[PDB]
Design an enzyme around this catalytic site. Structure first.
Site, mmCIF file in Angstrom:
data_model
loop_
_atom_site.group_PDB
_atom_site.id
_atom_site.type_symbol
_atom_site.label_atom_id
_atom_site.label_comp_id
_atom_site.label_asym_id
_atom_site.label_seq_id
_atom_site.Cartn_x
_atom_site.Cartn_y
_atom_site.Cartn_z
ATOM 1 N N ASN A 195 -12.857 2.694 -11.754
ATOM 2 C CA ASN A 195 -12.240 2.610 -13.082
ATOM 3 C C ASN A 195 -10.765 2.205 -13.058
ATOM 4 O OD1 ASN A 195 -13.059 3.066 -16.045
ATOM 5 N ND2 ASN A 195 -11.181 4.288 -15.871
ATOM 6 N N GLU B 53 -15.186 -2.161 -10.912
ATOM 7 C CA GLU B 53 -14.096 -2.015 -11.907
ATOM 8 C C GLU B 53 -12.708 -1.945 -11.279
ATOM 9 O OE1 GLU B 53 -13.398 -0.131 -16.197
ATOM 10 O OE2 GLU B 53 -15.021 0.981 -15.251
ATOM 11 N N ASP C 153 -22.612 0.189 -9.998
ATOM 12 C CA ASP C 153 -22.799 0.715 -11.339
ATOM 13 C C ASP C 153 -23.879 -0.107 -12.021
ATOM 14 O OD1 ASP C 153 -22.649 1.870 -13.869
ATOM 15 O OD2 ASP C 153 -20.555 1.325 -14.243
ATOM 16 N N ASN D 267 -25.178 0.883 -14.882
ATOM 17 C CA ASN D 267 -24.995 1.191 -16.308
ATOM 18 C C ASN D 267 -26.221 1.702 -17.054
ATOM 19 O OD1 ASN D 267 -22.287 1.138 -17.161
ATOM 20 N ND2 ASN D 267 -22.258 -1.097 -16.910
ATOM 21 N N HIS E 201 -16.190 8.009 -12.682
ATOM 22 C CA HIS E 201 -17.331 8.033 -11.783
ATOM 23 C C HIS E 201 -16.890 8.705 -10.496
ATOM 24 C CE1 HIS E 201 -19.691 4.593 -13.661
ATOM 25 N NE2 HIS E 201 -18.508 4.449 -14.229
HETATM 26 MG MG LIG Z 1 -15.318 2.918 -15.893
#
Ligand SMILES: [Mg+2]
EC number: 4.2.99.18
Length: 256
Positions: free
Chosen positions: A11, A37, A150, A152, A247
């Site tokens: 992130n 990310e 990820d 999602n 995460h």
């Molecule tokens: Mg994120």
């Protein structure tokens, strides 16, 4: 030989760097580290992030600044590194690293998310498709694959705190759950569910409600191998104590 691979939606790398990411990197010491990310443009990163000792580093930025991006740190470099599926609108968002380590291919993917609209959803699902086709061509040629990152999407009800109020929200739409079904049925294994059958195992929790301290979370991060290769995966766990992002990291351990 034992190979430890870690995968983490960080992130924003700069952001996780401010919460001792390097301290933890140096502690865990994995052979390959996949990141999703990164958000920052690689030519802007603190130098100590791009130049980690013992690790060659690979960055795959998006076109948009501040947005998406994937990265890979590896002790031994791969034969080659691919940054795309070969369809244009998917390859330009820094979501794809397909690195060839001779014994296996390592897919570092930051899948998109179908929120705010239907087109956003359409793009996620078409992305899913392009990925499935890509991994199959490689597997059919007799290569062994490892896909992490990820996704999602939480696979089953057992993969999130609140399934019932979420099955009309993107992340748990039957369509999205249906795809992971297809994906597996094509000959691939959710490595984590090979060793862990409990509920309440998550890889993401909303920052917005301090959801992690309650463990009201989702499992969005996965390690997948092709069935023919599952005999060689020794461990698959969730490093849920490791802080710094919305995460947490997840890990795979393999043999030869
Ligand atoms: Mg994120």
């Amino acid at each position: 030989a034992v190979l430890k691979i870690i995968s983490w939606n960080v992130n924003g790398l700069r952001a996780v760097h401010r919460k001792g990411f390097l301290k933890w990197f140096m502690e865990e010491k994995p052979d390959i580290l996949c990141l999703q990310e990164i958000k920052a443009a690689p030519e802007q990163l603190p130098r100590k992030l791009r130049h980690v000792e013992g690790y060659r580093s690979f960055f795959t930025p998006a076109e948009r600044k501040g947005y998406s991006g994937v990265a890979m740190y590896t002790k031994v470099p791969p034969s080659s590194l691919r940054e795309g599926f070969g369809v244009e609108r998917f390859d330009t968002e820094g979501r794809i690293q397909i690195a060839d380590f001779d014994d296996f291919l390592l897919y570092n993917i930051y899948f998109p998310n179908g929120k705010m609209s239907e087109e956003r959803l359409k793009y996620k699902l078409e992305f899913y498709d392009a990925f499935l086709e890509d991994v199959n061509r490689e597997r059919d040629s007799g290569r062994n694959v490892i896909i992490c990152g990820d996704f999602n999407t939480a696979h089953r009800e057992i993969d999130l705190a609140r399934p019932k109020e979420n099955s009309n929200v993107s992340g748990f739409l039957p369509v999205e759950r249906a795809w992971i079904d297809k994906f597996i049925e094509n000959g691939y294994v959710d490595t984590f569910r090979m060793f862990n059958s409990d509920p309440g195992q998550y890889t993401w929790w909303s920052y917005r409600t301090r959801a992690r301290e309650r463990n009201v979370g989702w499992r969005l991060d996965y390690f997948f191998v092709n069935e023919e290769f599952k005999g060689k995966v020794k461990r698959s766990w969730i490093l849920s104590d490791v802080m710094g992002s919305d995460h947490c990291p997840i890990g795979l351990e393999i043999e030869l």
